[PDB]
Design a protein around this ligand. Structure first.
Ligand SMILES: Cc1ncc(COP(=O)(O)O)c(C=O)c1O
Ligand SMILES: Cc1ncc(COP(=O)(O)O)c(C=O)c1O
Ligand SMILES: Cc1ncc(COP(=O)(O)O)c(C=O)c1O
Ligand SMILES: Cc1ncc(COP(=O)(O)O)c(C=O)c1O
Ligand code: NA
Ligand code: NA
Ligand code: NA
Ligand code: NA
Lengths: 375, 375, 375, 375
């Protein structure tokens, strides 16, 4: 079956006991056991189990894990290491992952090595004898740099590293790292998967039995589990993922065409443009596009004016909503970095990031263009 | 005002916007900001804020924190330390706290020193130059050993330790560690606070501004946050905490009287008995009792028969429900420990643990006694 | 078993499939059937079924029904009649029941006869050949008039009437009409049963198989069903009903003692006072008291001052909350009735109604008395 | 703006107080009032208000109403009449509407006249002096007969009738009766609007201030209101209505092409076929199609075999799910009607009804065709 079908019929989301076509919400903390032997030494919440089954199915994995946030998911995966271990990350990682690793886990002796992974040979140069993990976001934020997933998986296997992909921006609908050799795939399900700005959740999938066993142990020992109500809403939201991503992709193509032609717009960052670095790699490992786009207007006041002029783009920092969202990295996500290092990494003052939602394509193109025309 | 009043009117649990007498459930992930300056670099979920306000109020603290489990709360507090730091714990700690510390955080170089804290001088002997934290459960599980909270707080202040009390078994209704000098108090809110076996949650309260700031940073960086629906149910459940604890206490006194007189029952463990170690300390730091009781029947088959004979005690491993619960530590929580070390620590094969619920006192006394009479 | 036990273990509120100790929330609209014969021509939502089971158990009935409001429950019971049929009600009925009957169902040719049922002979005088139903609130609002339930049941059986009691003010914890011969008992579960001001619901119980069949048909044909989430919260709230009612009753006795002695207070209305009409009847059909009390201060400005002076009584129109509530009938529920008819029925301008909550008894007595002292 | 945009930004679904991008769930029953004058004599639940705002916006009405079921919505609209009043309905009405009217409201003296409304002159012939309402489903179930909405609105205005359209099968996305002169439009929101088989709800919209006032009075007097949790899930589901309906429509066109060409298939009923009665009317009042299709196989055992052979069509009686559904009217919805009257109205034994879901178009076409090929 094709993907839109698998979104509806894959996983276990019905109730075997009653035939209910949606999975019951087990708002409970305790399950009675028939006899005392069954209580050897979290007991699986069936609503959470349902969402773990969905994420394992959509990523062609064997094991799914649901955390109370994407940060809790990343944090759990990093706790697969010990003090003294090294992890390689793509060097434009920022936000939650960066803050967790550099302000929490370095205090536990986990060492972080940042690497431009757009060239996989950089990974090979960075490998030390203490390196245990390779962690890759692709495409990355906010400039959407693309990393060769298959080659990174090969390097990781050859050097004995656990390979991890943050697949939030692509979703399982367009890119399946486990199919390319990666050990663990994870998501901030808060974004496209939930899809409605109303669930904070992280999701992790793997095919490795032993990695899954260690993840289950970490989860049950540190306790960052997703609740049953949020698990329910996550499964619900994932039902329309294909339709939403396809609408978003149609709008993405049209919007990019408009931006590349507009006078007030300079550089445009998105893996669909041929001139974009590793465009061929992206087409080879994905069969669609993210809804995050970055582009340069002339300066900060042009950016702020763009925000104020748009009727349908909403000022906010998240992504993957049904509403289209707009932000200025240099004033929001990266305002802490000093201006010159920002400039030197690409985060010019006129950089704008949009997250395409599911409004009508013509409305989003026309709104953004009338806003740009006011410059 | 007295306590039952404070349970109803303390904290902020109403809606200022509409006048709603219960706190709205903010099933959302994003809040729109009026202008771009407000988005400097989790945004406070108002339902979670409401429950944090309640726990801070009930413990006479200044700051509350809600985690997706009691294990996530403990785990967050332990992440206040770095590799090389030492934490002292009471030596009969087991279950989630023990597993987290000895199987997760020792891998990050956090060293654990177990100490019989029923004698505070043992704490003073155990203090090393690397010791940073003193973590105390009182009363402990399953034998309900009592530790002098005030004296432990004094030792911790004098030696520069963060002092932490796990106050799950007493609840804020009967024992307030922050009032005795402790820095951080925490709870598995899954138990008495929620009170209905339908929420998995952890709660942490403090008066220390700087500790609160570090806890907020850890929370926002590792992401083990409680969801809005569970936050709601937790506040709801806390409304009846006084009535439930008082019923449980009435039944506890009657049940203990029955056990101390029964032929088939040998030792009884509960801090209300005069002969119990540190009974005077407990009366000095608490004004009521936990609903957990342990007692010895003759052997394992007597224990299993007791379980089978009771109409109103349910076999399960948790505690603090509206239902009364029954368990046998040596076959359940402590079955992994070899039999002779069990015996040597008190976990005889005939040890039974009950959690008194809110059924009618006469029914619980009579049911347990008719069961014991079948021995 | 005693009542507090039955509140915890009566009904079916666990999950047979998984052993979950709380009943799952079936947020679903459809159940798959194995083969096409099972789909003969609402399908029972198992969460709603659980709450219907609880209300049937607590009232010693055979059949329970959950509606989206107490008004929907009353409205469904009235639809047991046809145009031309007559129903007798106690004559101080007002609010939702009165509005429904006199502004909706008289338009369908259902005739209403109001009768002072404090004298059951008035019922017998009012019986016509078209009379089909006898509908009784006891105690009534806001003056708490008491009707002899057993005698009314006898009259109804002898004359072929369906007898209905609105048992909201007493709850199943204190008064069981089905045990006294009544055909149908109903509740605004919004009040004491839910108990937390967060569920709008109606509940109906019966032992009559044929009446139950007609109620099920009316329910499935008009569709005023309670949702699964509210059903869940209702069962949850009913768990603590005994503890809450007992606290409320303790405070009720103390508060009445204070009111009967205070200078600024004239008449006091509550069925516990010996001089209250039918006090002996009430003691004979109930084994506790409602938490609604009415009393007279001197005039409207004394009433408003009382409201403003109380720290713990909250101005609102509902009842059965964990918070104590205060209201002035003549300005709120009965402001529409002209002043002289109000006066003539008992609704003097200084009449105050309070609903006792579960705060500390001493706090509620002292707060109300300090407020009264400011007069 | 175009429709997909209006689905996202129309109505009030954000929180003004906090900026939350989704509407808070007000799980509450009571709102505190600042001073006693505000409590003159249901108070608007803001979650329900949000969904009423959405349905009013999507139908270009002024007033929205949410009921606990579509049956409760119909039932409320019918209670706009008195005993002796007559309502005209399209004559193939069945199921909930028919059962409500003929088994409940005729007992209240409301008279029902069934009329083939595919010819509006039949309406004019049926008008009596007691007629007060014209109630039309279009397209109808299960044969999808089409009624001229605009002409029916003209007849109703000219003769002083309240005109009502059941717009469930089309949704507001494709057909807007209020724009064609109709007084009241309603929906079983359980179907396409919620869209996920997890909400039971009815929705009613109007532009008439006085009709809205009477509906509000009926609602508040009979109490069939939608709960806050279901209101929330309904708004959530309506977010993707455009994407879902458009997918369903693409599959509908392809599936019909397959059915019209298949040997084992005889008649096909859907308003998109040119030869279908009133196809021109439907194109004139709607700009898309319903996902319900009916078609004839040869006999009952062919129908049952079709059901068993399909991988992606699920046996169930509802419609508007994300899953495609299959049913046989003569064995399910219409099994009660005697076989010969069934045959005489079109409900042959080989009639199959499908509800197209949002699976991949190719999968649904191919699955249904391979099933038909097994005949
Ligand atoms: C790398 C990264 N992951 C995750 C998040 C937030 O996701 P969640 O809300 O699910 O924790 C952020 C936000 O800044 C982020 O930068
Ligand atoms: C010390 C300790 N804390 C907490 C828990 C479980 O609490 P929660 O379910 O809230 O994580 C356990 C269970 O074994 C435990 O032993
Ligand atoms: C007789 C009666 N029943 C019920 C209610 C309200 O109960 P509910 O909110 O459950 O419909 C009222 C409110 O005025 C009332 O007067
Ligand atoms: C005419 C009609 N309306 C509504 C329904 C069911 O809708 P709901 O579940 O929202 O009451 C049915 C089911 O048979 C029906 O026939
Ligand atoms: Na692999
Ligand atoms: Na202190
Ligand atoms: Na009877
Ligand atoms: Na009009």
């Amino acid at each position: 079956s094709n993907k839109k079908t698998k979104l509806i019929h894959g996983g276990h989301t019905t109730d075997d006991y009653t035939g209910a076509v949606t999975t019951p919400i087990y708002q409970t903390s305790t399950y009675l056991q028939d006899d005392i032997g069954d209580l050897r030494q979290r007991t699986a919440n069936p609503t959470r189990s349902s969402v773990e089954s969905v994420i394992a199915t959509l990523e062609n994995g064997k094991h799914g894990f649901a955390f109370s946030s994407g940060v809790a998911a990343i944090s759990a995966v990093v706790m697969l290491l010990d003090k003294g271990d090294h992890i390689i990350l793509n060097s434009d990682v920022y936000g939650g992952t960066y803050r967790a690793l550099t302000k929490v886990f370095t205090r536990f002796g986990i060492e972080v090595d940042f690497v431009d992974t757009t060239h996989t040979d950089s990974i090979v140069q960075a490998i030390r004898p203490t390196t245990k993990m390779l962690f890759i976001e692709t495409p990355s934020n906010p400039l959407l740099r693309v990393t060769d997933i298959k080659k990174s998986a090969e390097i990781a296997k050859e050097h004995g590293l656990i390979s991890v992909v943050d697949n939030t921006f692509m979703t399982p609908y367009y890119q399946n790292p486990l199919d390319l050799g990666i050990d663990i795939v994870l998501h901030s399900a808060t974004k496209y998967l939930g899809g409605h700005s109303d669930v904070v959740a992280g999701l992790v999938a793997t095919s490795d039995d032993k990695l899954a066993e260690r993840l289950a142990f970490i989860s049950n020992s540190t306790g960052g589990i997703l609740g049953p109500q949020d698990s329910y809403l996550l499964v619900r939201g994932i039902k329309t993922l294909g339709l939403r991503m396809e609408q978003i992709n149609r709008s993405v193509i049209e919007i990019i065409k408009m931006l590349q032609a507009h006078p007030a717009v300079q550089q445009v960052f998105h893996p669909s443009i041929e001139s974009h670095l590793n465009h061929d790699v992206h087409m080879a490992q994905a069969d669609g596009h993210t809804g995050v786009i970055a582009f340069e207007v002339k300066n900060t006041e042009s950016a702020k004016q763009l925000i104020k002029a748009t009727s349908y783009y909403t000022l906010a920092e998240s992504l993957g909503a049904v509403e289209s969202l707009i932000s200025v990295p240099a004033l929001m996500t990266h305002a802490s970095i000093p201006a010159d290092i920002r400039a030197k990494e690409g985060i010019t003052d006129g950089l704008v990031r949009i997250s395409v939602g599911i409004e009508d394509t013509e409305d989003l193109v026309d709104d953004l263009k009338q806003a740009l025309d006011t410059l």
